[PDB]
Design a protein around this ligand. Structure first.
Ligand SMILES: [Mn+2]
Ligand SMILES: [Mn+2]
Ligand SMILES: [Mn+2]
Ligand SMILES: [Mn+2]
Ligand SMILES: [Mn+2]
Ligand SMILES: [Mn+2]
Ligand SMILES: [Mn+2]
Ligand SMILES: [Mn+2]
Lengths: 292, 292, 292
């Protein structure tokens, strides 16, 4: 029971232990959206948190300090000063070097697991990229760390078959929130089936069962983009076919997403914002009921 | 020290802890064999268990309840009522929803590890399928959970080279029971070599060493199909090349196995039953000696 | 808390109290170098250790016994008598059978972690081989076990892109020692970027941060070959293209390095020896400062 006393890794948690909490990544705000819409979303998520009675804990690293529950001003400062995009393996160097960093899903789940946050929300996870050599730390983290992650499936830029198959391989359980269709970020339909659940109570029973059986995996609760905003995948696919990928590593994802906003004259941005907002609502409902 | 109390995940063990025990999956009985042969195999295995002095604990999920040591009547009910095929990640879903489920090797090792069963028997494990995107949870579980698994290698429908290579990558130790040839389910030879051991005592020395050095991996003890039933691999390969794969996910394996039974007029079925029965015998000898 | 008492796994540690320690593999000496050069290097590395104030613990298995801190005379016996090349999964097998074995990086990190050695030194790690189905245990180990590993990157015979991507996927942190370029064993130049650190104090900060945040991964400290011994990678590649790979499994790596010694007229042997010696120095500096 007697654990080590930290010196180098300073965590500043603004989260009340006795109150529902949803963790959220910073890279969506810093690298995944334009500034104006990024701050509008933050504000809207905070509004939803007040409406529903949960704490929204945006997670980032500010000059080497891990902050759970960043403020708007902190997020603006981060965007203005610049911040590396970090997954799990990058957390140590940025902490050691005293840098700003915006977390992906992998780092966000990793850190959430160490500060008592069980429900995390994102837009879409990383996965296996076309070519099947470039593979997100997100998959590794979900195979290693227990949480409930609300998402609209996996990002549209990915090798869908390879990612969906590897989620099975890695023993990452999936459930569709009121759908049997694995969602694909901008798109509702994938033609891949998942088990359907009808309410948040069912999520909690699965998750509690995972705990009892010591299954240390992320539960993916899949929440499709609202129909009104969806862009059918057949349409996204074809745009992706025109884009020469000029970059690698962590720039790949931001690069393609920014290109798709340009190409669809903002349609993908509208979709992305809509699903992020819906996902925050669902994540909040889960966090509120978990806390009972 | 102090562990949680289970509420959702009810395990009914019919094992006497003081007697030797071998765990066995349900999917082979429910999805991998025809009913008549499945029940005759179950009865023959129990007979062997009584003759050699170990308990055969067939593991499955009945209306959400984990049963270790299913009866012939329970297995018949499962067949009649239907059961999901479940690997590890699916256990929580079926427990939560109160469904029947027949376990694969992954789920069976995972549960065995939580209920004190150290020896598991199968016919052939899953692996990397042709195309190398579809990969069994069996590999992940074997790379995560310690047990002694007796099998006749990996199923003949797999990408043999990719699977054999990944077993090494994942640090999954393989030993031939009185052979240096990696077996391939219906076939005695794969063309690949493994280290050989001579007896059950040598298996247990490896296993005990793994415990002492905290190597949490499955030890695969390889037992070839009897020579009078074996089918040369090239024959199976040529048949498989004539099958259009009309299914995906969990259906792939039972689909291909059923097609091969039809194409070989039961030749593969007789091989499969032969190797299952011999594997039960070897697993029971290990379980009996382990018990001291 | 109370741990088990060992019976089967005898570990003989020659490490003394009150002294920094660096762990080192045996397969380099046994399978990776000619006899004369290997014994020469062992003596040199010992000299560096006495002069700099650390213990160099060459790890191997002598007739089933794990020895940390082998003598010259033991190494010589091992070469004369023969030793299996073993990664992690093979340790229990050779321990049980009472065989000599020379450890790879995987086995060396695994063992080091169980005997309190935190700094390990090698020349180059394994990785993803061309074709991408053969993948070293080294990668799995580094994604499972915490240590500081000094190497000159990954061996030149590997699929460099695949390996480099998989290091990210598995969450293996990398830092360049006074370089931003990922080294390639005989070559300094990969065109692949890593974060640059300037001194051993920076290494220790990153490593201590990893402990505090429960990141159980190997930290790769990347030390390029000295410029006077460097061979351009394209030159190495051109030569590898002229080789028919006539072998599989563990034999691949030594088979190809030997061929390169032959085709290059000792040139790779000389580079190999120089980087191993420089890596020993760096690992010793790390070990000494860690202990404080
Ligand atoms: Mn503001
Ligand atoms: Mn439990
Ligand atoms: Mn990537
Ligand atoms: Mn131990
Ligand atoms: Mn063939
Ligand atoms: Mn599959
Ligand atoms: Mn800590
Ligand atoms: Mn290999």
């Amino acid at each position: 029971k007697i654990h080590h006393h930290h010196h180098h890794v300073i965590i500043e948690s603004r989260i009340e232990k006795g109150k529902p909490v949803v963790g959220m990544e910073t890279t969506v705000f810093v690298h995944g959206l334009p500034r104006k819409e990024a701050i509008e979303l933050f504000r809207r998520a905070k509004e939803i948190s007040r409406e529903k009675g949960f704490q929204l804990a945006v997670i980032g690293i500010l000059k080497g300090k891990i902050v759970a529950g960043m403020s708007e001003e902190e997020l603006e400062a981060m965007m203005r000063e610049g911040a590396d995009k970090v997954g799990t393996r990058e957390i140590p160097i940025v902490v050691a070097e005293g840098k700003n960093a915006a977390t992906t899903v992998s780092a966000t789940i990793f850190l959430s697991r160490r500060i008592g946050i069980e429900v995390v929300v994102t837009g879409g996870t990383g996965g296996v990229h076309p070519g099947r050599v470039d593979v997100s730390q997100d998959l590794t983290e979900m195979s290693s760390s227990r949480a409930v992650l609300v998402s609209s499936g996996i990002k549209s830029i990915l090798d869908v078959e390879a990612t969906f198959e590897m989620l099975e391989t890695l023993e990452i359980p999936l459930v569709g929130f009121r759908t049997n269709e694995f969602p694909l970020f901008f798109s509702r339909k994938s033609g891949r089936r998942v088990p359907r659940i009808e309410n948040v109570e069912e999520v909690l029973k699965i998750y509690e069962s995972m705990k009892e059986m010591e299954l240390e995996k992320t539960l993916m609760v899949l929440n499709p983009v609202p129909e009104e905003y969806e862009i059918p995948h057949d349409e996204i696919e074809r745009l992706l076919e025109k884009i020469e990928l000029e970059v690698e590593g962590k720039e790949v994802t931001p690069f393609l997403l920014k290109k798709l906003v340009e190409m669809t004259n903002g349609r993908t941005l509208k979709a992305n914002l809509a699903l992020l907002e819906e996902n925050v609502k669902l994540a909040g409902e889960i966090a509120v009921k978990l806390k009972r």
